[PDB]
Design an enzyme around this catalytic site. Sequence first.
Site, PDB file in Angstrom:
ATOM      1  N   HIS A  76       0.693  -1.199   0.347  1.00 39.60           N
ATOM      2  CA  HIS A  76       0.240  -0.048  -0.133  1.00 39.60           C
ATOM      3  C   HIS A  76       0.859   1.154  -0.165  1.00 39.60           C
ATOM      4  CE1 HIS A  76      -3.539  -1.488   0.956  1.00 39.60           C
ATOM      5  NE2 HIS A  76      -3.080  -3.209   2.040  1.00 39.60           N
ATOM      6  N   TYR A 363       2.108  -4.689  11.901  1.00 42.27           N
ATOM      7  CA  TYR A 363       2.273  -3.309  11.924  1.00 42.27           C
ATOM      8  C   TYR A 363       2.826  -2.375  13.014  1.00 42.27           C
ATOM      9  CZ  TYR A 363      -1.745  -4.418   8.267  1.00 42.27           C
ATOM     10  OH  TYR A 363      -2.208  -4.456   7.684  1.00 42.27           O
TER      11      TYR A 363
END
Lengths: 701, 701
Positions: A76, A363
């Site tokens: 992304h 993350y």
Amino acid sequence: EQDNAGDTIEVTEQPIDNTLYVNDTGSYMTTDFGTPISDQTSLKAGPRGPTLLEDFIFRQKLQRFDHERVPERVVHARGAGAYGTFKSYADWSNVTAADFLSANDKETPMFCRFSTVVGFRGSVDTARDVHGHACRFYTDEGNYDIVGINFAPFFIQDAIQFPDLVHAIKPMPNNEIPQAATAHTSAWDFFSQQSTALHSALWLMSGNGIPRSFRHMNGYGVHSFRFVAANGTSKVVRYRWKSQQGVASLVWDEAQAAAGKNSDYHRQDLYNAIANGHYPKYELQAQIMDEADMLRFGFDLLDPTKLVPEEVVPYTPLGMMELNANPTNYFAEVEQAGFQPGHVVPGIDFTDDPLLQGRLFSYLDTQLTRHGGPNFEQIPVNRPRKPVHNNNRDGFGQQQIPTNNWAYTPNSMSNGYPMQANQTQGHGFFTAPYRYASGHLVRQTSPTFNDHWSQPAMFWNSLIPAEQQMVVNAIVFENSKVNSPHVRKNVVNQLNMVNNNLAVRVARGLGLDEPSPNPTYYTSNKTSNVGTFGKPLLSIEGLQVGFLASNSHPESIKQGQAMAAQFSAAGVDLNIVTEAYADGVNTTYALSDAIDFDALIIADGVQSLFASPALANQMNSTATSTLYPPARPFQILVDSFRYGKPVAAVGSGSVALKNAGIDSSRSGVYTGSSETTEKIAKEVLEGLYTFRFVDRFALDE
Amino acid sequence: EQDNAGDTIEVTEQPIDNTLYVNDTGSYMTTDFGTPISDQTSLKAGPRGPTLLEDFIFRQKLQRFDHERVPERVVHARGAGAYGTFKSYADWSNVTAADFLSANDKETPMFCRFSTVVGFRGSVDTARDVHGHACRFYTDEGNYDIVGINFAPFFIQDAIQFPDLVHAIKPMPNNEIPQAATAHTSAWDFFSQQSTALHSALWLMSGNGIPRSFRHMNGYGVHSFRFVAANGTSKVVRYRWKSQQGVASLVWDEAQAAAGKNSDYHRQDLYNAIANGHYPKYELQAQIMDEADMLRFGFDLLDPTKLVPEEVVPYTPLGMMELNANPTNYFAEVEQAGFQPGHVVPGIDFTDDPLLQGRLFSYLDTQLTRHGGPNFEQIPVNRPRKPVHNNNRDGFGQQQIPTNNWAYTPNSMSNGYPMQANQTQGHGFFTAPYRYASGHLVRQTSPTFNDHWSQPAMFWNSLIPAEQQMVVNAIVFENSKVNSPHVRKNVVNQLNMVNNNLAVRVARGLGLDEPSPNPTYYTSNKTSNVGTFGKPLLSIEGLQVGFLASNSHPESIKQGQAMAAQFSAAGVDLNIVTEAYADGVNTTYALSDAIDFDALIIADGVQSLFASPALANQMNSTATSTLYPPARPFQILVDSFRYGKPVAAVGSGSVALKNAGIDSSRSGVYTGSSETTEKIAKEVLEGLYTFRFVDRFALDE
Ligand code: HEM
Ligand code: HEM
Ligand SMILES: [Cl-]
Ligand SMILES: [Cl-]
């Protein structure tokens, strides 16, 4: 801390400058350490001499420059953000203790980023891809992030496989080809050897892979999460962001054209819409299920390759988000933002979804890579709206100054601050107390996860025939780009476990043997709201109309301008296009393409611009226009029609339509005399809502 | 070090594994610390349970993944590399003590990277841009890098302005739009307020901004450097890499199409050419000038906005480079490579070019950003071919083990090692000893640098009329995208100081008032080899032919195949294209576009594929082919013709030509019966060398 002189500590807070937003108005340039400077000429030993090491002005400026870049996101990388607000529809305390959901009309600040997945930082917006939909609620009890995508299912069932999926879809490691695309051997190899991928692969091949814009797709949490009530009772939930603009998509050759004409198509769309007051909205919805529902529906709610059909469990509307402001600095606010699915708040919990479980590690760790150190949450866009208090300390880039000198628990020196928070005091996070585990410590997949094909079958049945053809065309396109015959054949065999008609059509496209029905996992079931053609938009705000005029027929510009009030009133931008700028002209043939407009209107009296390439080819060299490539106006028209967009023609504009082989009897073709432009406009508004005229798309079986 | 027991040090070298290239054949998977593993399922508390923190296999794999990315280059992020070799034409010791130039036929290993400038890592190859041409000679006396571009001049005259130029041309900071393009207010504002930029701006607007490939552009060092002989005498030199393939370029709309159809167009071209044995060559050449020449030619040799015209000082051929191998791992070898203009070797020196002088600081500093630490030269691609010996120590990522425990100079403990090297022993680097400076310490520009316009005028006069039109079209395109009228007008006024005809044509394109001649800096002078149209290629190896056939006329494939031997023998790839793969088919309509081929041949008997969009539009829905978008074959043909490419047609193929309005009498159109395919092939070879037929491009004044 003060039963004695030694442990008593004097705090003198220094009057340190604490600027956030930087405002240059009125100022002289200074170094980063505040010395006023010029920055336009190196210091030299004579005007034709060598540059001196003592030129600290030169060095500080270039050192900043030389260090501007940071690692992009591993996935992304290509994306765009905006701020907004969220309003709860209700007090939801009966199902969740979440504070941002605790009252009717309660408002919470928001920041979201939308993105593709595979391409690197400057890759084309209109790549065929998954799209991210990641939103932060800046709640009174912490930053809550929903880090979702525009497809309901994901490709894999365990986080440990994530680097496998990603290396497979990313460019090949020997030569870094190809960019932003699954159209290569490795990706389709992975999708066929790891058949969990089929559901998401079909989504990707549908229009969902190529949305019109960030405003015209939905968002999904994908995973099951939990709502946890104050008293400990939990519900299993799945999130959907339902776009209030509606869902709309491109066709492949159009997505390609857009990639070459405007790589910034989606980010520009979002920026312009917000700047023009057309603020996109998405309704937060949740399927709210019981714990007992885990295996009830014939698949496993821990399984991220499976959606729960709306027809089995409806989506409950929770509240409305609106995005209403652009960022001030892209690097500071968008590039540096770090969303994490582990950014949860009290009243939210996890499930044992093995894909979700690993994201929680990944993350938090990845934020180190992109920020150079551990203080990434201190970056303004990542800060919670209330001050942080904990005993974490130090680390690169520490721009706070702790005053609590007793940074440990338990202690008898700090007056109990900061206080432990939990279920029963301080609104502390708590794991849902009825959660339970029982088992050997195993590296084994659950057998409830074994059906990789039934839901792909449902998805296929859920698409109108035109979009089914689009899926076939995409699969055929990508698998023709795949260089390996054996992978092509594996893909066919996998697809044949989903739907025989699908697989036969693909094998035909690939020049391969046609497989025979393999009915084990076949179904006639279907679900709604998972396609991107055949259902109109809910809002046409911020869409674009191209009004094709000419400087050589000045009344055409005026005709364009007299339609502008009607489009403006619908929040639609009317762009008058001629050969070159002039009074009332908005853009030019040379700058223009079909992808720039959602509908096209040909003006009265300009038919002579719309010469076909064949006509262009006769008269070459002298007296052909230099102001745009040969047959550019014609091409805009032919492309717009091919892509399925509404097209209108005023007066002799209909001559252009005929030249293009477009009969005025086709759906989404509007014609009228110069006296009926008002009615032509309203028909164009009509066509914008329908958005695409699928009767123009070739069908097979 | 051993006049005593205490300073005497025992060295025991441990048998540590020293793998470079990793070879997986035969192996089981292991962690990075060598424990054999599987990596396909998380460790869980029961098969439907939560993932355990103790799953170190999961964590090590995702930590690697989460940390894969590194900062891209601040400029020239998008690029591709290859290894090769360089052969000296002579012993050049009379002018330079450089070792790689010290003997006839002396060979030196090479690694080069080619790139654009402005776009980020995954931006489109065919962006209009400067292109990097950066090559490392791995000499016996150190890594010598020539870090050049495909334009002869640069935009600015002082390194301190580099962050200004770059921020101006990069995407806007509020929203990061637009990608990989100067077509926005800030860039043209900069080029017009900082009028040094005009020379390079014209290059950028010419075909030089959009080359056919890395193999079809030249390289320039831009700056004056010095050759230094063993005895201290120096020469001032300027480098050119003359492509042995020749110089060829796209037209803008074609560059756009390529960006949307194949973002990897140049990297793929280079990879394929090398893999197919068509190794690109470039001849190293230098204008070899005297110290006395600094101001002789009416501009300053320290000035990087000025080229020395070949007609004033000829280029002396020095030797030949060939690139003959692809990298093994792109990240390791290409992404991590760090070129520096300060990577010089004995016999090379600098000049007081204020642009060059700052680059020497910038590139050494920037290597820290991209590598996370100071040991970037230790990365294999950056290592010199002989072992390093110095007293530098430590730093993140130290993978060597120094044995010299007396790491300082002067010392009496290390037996004089390592020895100081200089002009007279050890082949040490030395500054050219006649270099001199004299002056106040000044932040002032040299008045010799003040003419920003004369050389832009020469460049304009150096382009064929068709390419002059291309420059006008580009300027008009970019300045129409510029949103600010006042910047548009500033650009016009600047251009009017260069050439009145140029400026009038641009103002017309922009709808602005036409300026009047301003003759101060005008000239009729011109120079050769600075254009990209009107001069044929020197080699057609590795170019592409598209042979358009059909599965519905099987003899067409066979016709294609019988031509293949002739193209293969010229090193030209013949690609047979049909609707779908089949015996003898190479690619498909759906995968194909004009940009994929350098010449197009239409087969006998397939004319029915070549329906125009108008014809396509009549019969829509049923019985229109699903195998490719409507009128795809026609579009390939029309596009190829428009772009100026050679097109041939066999037999009834000429029907397709007529449909497209292409007369068989046009230059670069070849027709023949099915019995003359051999002659048609050779005419296509002819047309490939001419490369583009400029008689097809519309001209103005
Ligand atoms: C349901 C499946 C998933 C969804 C919906 C999802 C969603 C997203 C989104 C939307 C982003 C971009 C956030 C942004 O705009 O900055 C992102 C980034 C990322 N995702 Fe995922 N993801 C999924 C699966 C996974 C898995 C299984 C992993 C790894 C275990 C993973 C690792 C990452 C990483 C490392 C990033 C980079 C984040 C950063 O650098 O800030 N994702 N994901
Ligand atoms: C004659 C003018 C110039 C030429 C011919 C030139 C050439 C290049 C090339 C070819 C690259 C890419 C090397 C690669 O492929 O990895 C590059 C990168 C770079 N250039 Fe320049 N450049 C010029 C001017 C400047 C100036 C004035 C500065 C700054 C003072 C500068 C700073 C940089 C930096 C920081 C990089 C990134 C290098 C890296 O990260 O390894 N350049 N330049
Ligand atoms: Cl669970
Ligand atoms: Cl000098």
